[PDB]
């Protein structure tokens, strides 16, 4: 396809322009695609040029880009591997503000996401960084961030409750009409409740899991 | 009220014997007086005495008073607010003796609540007084007694579980009976049970969502 | 008995043949035994001849005997006590390669094990270990071991959110047909499924506080 040619284009990597020009139709083609399967495929090509080459402009761009792609996305497994791809870049990575700003992109992600389990994910990266990273100062700063995205979790769980205990009293009054009539109809919408209760209850249950891994990460 | 017009007296601070003979009757007036908003501003009061002026007897008088009013006061939502008293007292404060009993204080008003909510709210105040303390040895101090409300917390989560896996089995076995016979009265006895089952989840959940955040504190 | 006989006989500790004389066939009375009581007795005063005595290869084989008899049995009570035999044995140890040996079997024993509690002890016996073990690189050897099992019940604390997602998706297909027919039949039949939600809802909580306290003991 022309995705694919556009990305043997970027194998030879001959002048910083010609990058510039790749990486732009290559976002353009990102954008307005439903398949996420290219998508993907594009991601992990523009994180292949941001790891090569040189230039901190043109690796902030694609880190942009990236992020972009990540903004609009509603997939939070197309999100994942584009945190992945932004995780990837700065392990590879010889200057401390060049991650510094990525995963202070990663951090904004975070906060931007709805779910609590990309959090975690998110968290996971920025925690295999600080692994590989050395020099203090820089880890010091990831486990800043890393307490950051367990505030978030934290405060998504507290709201997790919250429409726990509102369904929970919705079911306590449901529960209370049934006593006074034992009719089918007051059955079966007791029997609603529940499985909102049961799926609200599952929900805060993940909620939970992705903040206990947060805490573990750190 | 008497009860501002006995806060304008405190706010000359004259003498010392002055303030004990208004904190005196301030804290009277707070005991057996219904209204949580009249016992909130006499303990905003209170504090404000303890975090001015001078001489610890003063200060350590006006804890003990808050701590009784703490230990009395069935509504969380005053208990805290107490709690928080402790804490600003105990952030302006020039003696580490002092923030000493302070924390000590509030370790033993954890220990006494039977809210793990209430345990939670406790342990995030003792972590904003480390953040601001300094000095070593105090903080170290602050970590010991944080660990020591995870330790109640974690107990307070075991007896929500064998209270849940009790209702559990007790679910079980009232399922038990309508495979039996499936009438109308032992599906609502099943209802009953279920909801019972929900309330003591939600419960659990939490005083496990209080645990998770005291782990994060620390 | 000739259990009590031959704990007897490893009081005196005349000799080291004597003692693998005994502990032999004392791991072999433990073996196919279905008291459990017996066997505890036996684990004690095992442990009592490897706390007590010298050389490592009695101590290993000692160790190794324990070991065998927890992966052997599905009592949680019984391998907790064993598990309990090991850490006091490697409390009571004057050489740092004793208690790595007896740390890493510890670990094994957390990997092979199904019960996210039983892990939860088990980092409940490192944790003692560590805190009066003393002695850097040694204390960091179990810190490695410790978040190894907390990532032993993140992984069963997932497995456990998967299949709450599974009964979950069948309680909500129930629930559909249940809109469809409001018979009886569907009824009691979305009672099951609510049951197994319930149960499986428990069993998610348990592994989740299991984690919790993994958490705190690190």
């Known amino acids: 396809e022309r995705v694919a040619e ?8 001959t002048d910083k322009e010609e990058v510039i020009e790749i990486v732009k139709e290559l ?11 290219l998508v993907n495929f594009i991601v992990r090509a ?5 790891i090569a080459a040189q230039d901190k402009e043109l690796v902030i761009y694609i880190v942009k880009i990236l992020a972009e792609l ?14 992945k791809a932004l995780a990837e870049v700065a392990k590879a ?3 401390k503000e060049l991650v510094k700003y990525i995963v202070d992109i ?11 389990t990309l959090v975690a994910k998110i968290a996971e990266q920025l925690a295999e960084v600080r692994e590989e ?12 961030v890393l307490k950051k995205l367990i505030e978030i979790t934290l405060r998504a769980l507290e709201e997790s409750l919250r429409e726990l205990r509102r369904i929970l009293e919705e079911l306590k009054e449901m529960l209370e009409r049934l006593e006074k009539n034992p ?15 049961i799926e609200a209850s599952v929900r805060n249950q993940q909620i939970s899991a992705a903040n206990q891994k947060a805490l573990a990460l750190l």
């Open 133 to 144: 990273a050395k020099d203090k100062e820089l880890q010091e700063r990831i486990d800043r």
């Open 27 to 37: 976002a353009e083609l990102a954008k307005q695609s439903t398949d996420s399967e």
């Open 106 to 116: 990663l951090l904004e992600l975070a906060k931007q996401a709805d779910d609590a």
């Open 46 to 50: 523009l994180a292949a040029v941001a």
């Open 183 to 197: 009719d089918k109809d007051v059955i079966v919408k007791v029997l609603k409740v529940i499985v909102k209760a």
């Open 70 to 83: 990540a903004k609009q996305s509603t997939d939070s497994e197309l999100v994942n591997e584009i945190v």
């Open 6 to 13: 556009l990305a043997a284009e970027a194998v030879r990597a």
């Open 93 to 95: 990575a010889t200057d």
